[PDB]
Design a protein around this nucleic acid. Structure first.
Lengths: 155, 114, 78, 125, 60, 96, 23
RNA sequence: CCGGGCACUCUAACGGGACUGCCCGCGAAAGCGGGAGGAAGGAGGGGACGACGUCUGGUCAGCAUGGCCCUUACGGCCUGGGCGACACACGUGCUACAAUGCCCACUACAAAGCGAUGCCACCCGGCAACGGGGAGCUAAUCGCAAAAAGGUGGGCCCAGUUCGGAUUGGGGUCUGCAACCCGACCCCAUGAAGCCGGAAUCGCUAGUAAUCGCGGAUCAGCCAUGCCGCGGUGAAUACG
């Protein structure tokens, strides 16, 4: 996309809750294409959002997204002969991808036995303020603003 | 000791435990469960002396096993290298026997390189 | 079932050991299997350049001919 | 008696008969839920029945040959979105605007001579 | 060793393993297509001249 | 069962409507032209004489099968089709 | 997996049968 | 499966269809944005096709070809060896270091092809490789043939391990005159490294990458993890 704007693909809803952001997390839970295995691990762990802390698997997910989505990020740019990390607002589309991705990583790293077990846990804790993706979101955000010295070094 | 040539594997099952011995893999092991009546399930602490001194009475009697077999295979080298025999001549070299390239790779018979 | 020894050599062999055991049979048959009559002699086997002799014993009966006169010269690297 | 819809999607063949009534579903001589067990893309080509509210206007008989499990599924999606615009040619309204018509030419590509799997190029120096 | 070689493929010798596909207009040993009797480069230049019965250049 | 083999279809599809058209005028009652799935043999070749594995090309052998049946046989049917228009490159087959 | 012959996945990749994968 | 039927599915030939052609927006024109109808729109996806030329690029070892040179040898046959050597060095790759895993049972859903001293249905014997017997096909009607993953539900429980299959010992088969050097396939046992990799680097934009199995060629057999194909599940992202 030197030329064009690089087409943003919509996703399907998910047959189970009809949510285009539930397909977007399951795709990032995916591995080797084996999506049938990618989909259990949600509803395997959605069930773990329901068993433990009896609530709403629909809504604990959708909060855990907004509880890891970073409004300010820093990317390094070259000026003078310097490597200044530039303060910038990470766009909403970048957010979705950013939110979901840390959410898989932080979860995969967890010391729990089954995959979904972690997945649920993380989602729970993200909305609760204390996850692994939630550190990373604050890390980037306060990495920015620590760098507001480079705010007009933004495009 | 405990069982067989003097080895010990509890806290796991009996069959997987019988693997852990020299001269029994996964096949000879489930052929011993056949010939004694033990059922591969039981967790070795969960076996009682009877079916464990039954175990032994068969396995310590049929095959060889610990101490030996190490000496038995080694006398298939003791003779191989004392013989002709090229194959025992690349035991005297520390080199791959079953005809692989040595120009490249070939490490597990030489060890990490120098 | 199947054991292979050329039979131009086992012809001499069962003619040599028979008609007064000598030794020193030169041959180009390392493909043969050293059948148990060869026991105690001296076969001069061809590795390609040289006829390396072998003093045949019991310690190697079911064995072939060409393992016993290796084709390559090693000695070392360095 | 029936309503018929030809379905394909990437080397798949799904022949449907929207024989009216309750809503029970057989493909290749068993319940949709028996054949398509495990699969979560398996709920499905019954979704075109959700664009014209007719979960309770049609049982189904289907024959299917080719591709794979979820590749057969998208065939019946053209096979159920066609068997409804056939019944009521005024029901493509909320079918093509809802995008359940058409047939996706999203085929697996010819492996190229040189590139290890169509495009996955060899590593160089 | 080359021509006296191609002669040697024409005369089956001591065993049945010992035969191979040499070539005809090529004296070529490798990449011998036995259906065509032709040796990958034999094959190709005659495929372009059309001296090969209904052998198309593909495209799909 | 008049199993018509061949390489070229346009020459093969002029004579399988020839023993189609002509036996119908000479008896009964001609099974129309049935086309079997063509059996394809390919040849992928290193274009260059030497090394150049990176560059090759694709050649195929399309030998398309064609069957056709005669329903009510008759005489004059195998004597109208005893002497037949060729072409230089078409394969025949007789059965019943 | 596919290099451990003495199992199911090992024979398949390889194109073989026996005990751990029979016919 | 029989009748029975071509509507299907499929097969394989000839046709149809997209044309910025219709509207809206802007533009001098061409042309861009957006709309409808449309199976597909703006090269719809891929292939094939790659300019005058460049790199004194590559092949005299496919072949031919100017010349130089050898003509009981630089010809030629043959037996045996080497092309597979190993102190090391780099490229392409295979299988991994596990639990989104491995193992075992059972259960589904492809495509492309190839099949006569061939593909071998099916029984019998073998833990098996295989070994007998033996049915059918000139092959859309017999055969390779199993797809695999997946799905079900049980085993494993974080263990250098039911992770991983190297190494070696022994007993075996098949091809073949002949498997010492140097073959694959099988059974038992041995079960090494490796707990994801420094500096560096490669591939790929949609059905692509990833992951999974299947064929074919050459080939007696085979050292294919290679190559040329085929389809199964099926993403990530693109401010610039």
């Amino acid at each position: 996309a030197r030329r064009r704007r690089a087409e943003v693909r919509q996703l399907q809803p998910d047959l189970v809750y009809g949510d285009v952001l539930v397909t977007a997390f399951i795709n990032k839970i995916m591995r080797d294409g084996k999506k049938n295995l990618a989909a259990r691990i949600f509803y395997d762990a959605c069930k773990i959002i329901q068993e433990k802390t009896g609530q709403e698997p629909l809504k604990v997910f959708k909060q855990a997204v907004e509880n890891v989505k970073p409004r300010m990020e820093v990317r390094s740019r070259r000026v003078g002969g310097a490597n200044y990390q530039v303060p910038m607002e990470v766009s909403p589309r970048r957010q979705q991808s950013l939110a979901l991705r840390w959410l898989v990583q932080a979860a995969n790293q967890r010391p729990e036995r089954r995959a979904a077990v972690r997945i649920a846990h993380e989602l729970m804790d993200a909305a609760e303020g204390k996850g692994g993706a939630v550190k990373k979101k604050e890390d980037v955000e306060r990495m920015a603003e620590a760098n507001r010295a480079y705010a007009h070094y933004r495009w | 000791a405990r069982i067989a040539g003097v080895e010990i594997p509890r806290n796991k099952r009996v069959d997987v435990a019988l693997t852990y011995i020299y001269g029994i893999g996964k096949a000879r092991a489930k052929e011993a469960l056949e010939k004694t009546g033990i059922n591969p399930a039981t967790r070795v602490k969960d076996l009682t002396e009877a079916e464990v001194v039954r175990l032994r009475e068969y396995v310590e009697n049929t095959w060889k096993l610990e101490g030996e077999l190490r000496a038995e295979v080694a006398a298939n080298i003791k003779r191989l290298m004392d013989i002709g025999c090229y194959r025992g001549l690349r035991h005297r070299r520390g080199l791959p026997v079953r005809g692989q390239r040595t120009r490249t790779n070939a490490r597990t018979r030489k060890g990490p390189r120098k | 079932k199947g054991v292979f020894v050329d039979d131009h050599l086992l012809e001499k062999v069962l003619e040599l050991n028979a008609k007064g055991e000598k030794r020193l049979i030169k041959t180009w048959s390392r493909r043969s299997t050293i059948v148990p009559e060869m026991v105690g002699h001296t076969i001069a086997v061809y590795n390609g350049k040289q006829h390396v002799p072998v003093y045949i014993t019991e310690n190697m009966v079911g064995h072939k001919l060409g393992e016993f006169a290796p084709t390559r010269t090693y000695r070392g690297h360095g | 008696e029936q309503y018929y819809g030809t379905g394909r999607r990437k080397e798949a063949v799904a022949r449907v008969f929207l024989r009216p009534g309750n809503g029970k579903v057989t493909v290749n001589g068993q319940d949709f839920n028996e054949y398509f067990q495990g699969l979560v893309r398996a709920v499905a080509a019954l979704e075109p029945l959700r664009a014209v509210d007719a979960l309770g206007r049609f049982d189904a008989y289907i024959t299917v040959r080719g591709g794979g499990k979820s590749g057969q599924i998208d065939a019946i999606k053209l096979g159920i979105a066609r068997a409804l615009v056939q019944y009521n040619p005024d029901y493509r309204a909320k079918l093509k605007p809802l995008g359940f018509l058409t047939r996706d030419a999203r085929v697996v590509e010819r492996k190229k001579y040189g590139k290890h799997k169509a495009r996955r190029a060899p590593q160089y120096s | 060793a080359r021509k006296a070689l191609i002669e040697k493929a024409k005369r089956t010798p001591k065993f049945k393993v010992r035969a191979y596909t040499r070539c005809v207009r090529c004296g070529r040993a490798r990449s011998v297509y036995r259906f065509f009797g032709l040796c990958r480069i034999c094959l190709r230049e005659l495929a372009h001249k059309g001296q090969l019965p209904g052998v198309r250049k593909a495209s799909w | 069962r008049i199993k018509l083999r061949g390489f070229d279809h346009k020459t093969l599809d002029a004579s399988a409507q020839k023993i189609v058209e002509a036996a119908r005028r000479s008896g009964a009652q001609v099974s129309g032209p049935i086309p079997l799935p063509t059996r394809v043999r390919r040849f992928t070749v290193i274009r260059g004489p030497f090394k150049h594995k990176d560059s090759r090309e694709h050649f195929e052998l399309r030998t398309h099968n064609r069957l056709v049946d005669i329903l009510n046989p008759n005489r004059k049917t195998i004597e109208q089709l005893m002497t037949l228009d060729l072409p230089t490159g078409v394969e025949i087959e007789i059965k019943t | 997996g596919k290099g451990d012959r003495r199992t199911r996945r090992g024979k398949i990749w390889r194109g073989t049968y026996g005990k751990y994968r029979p016919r």
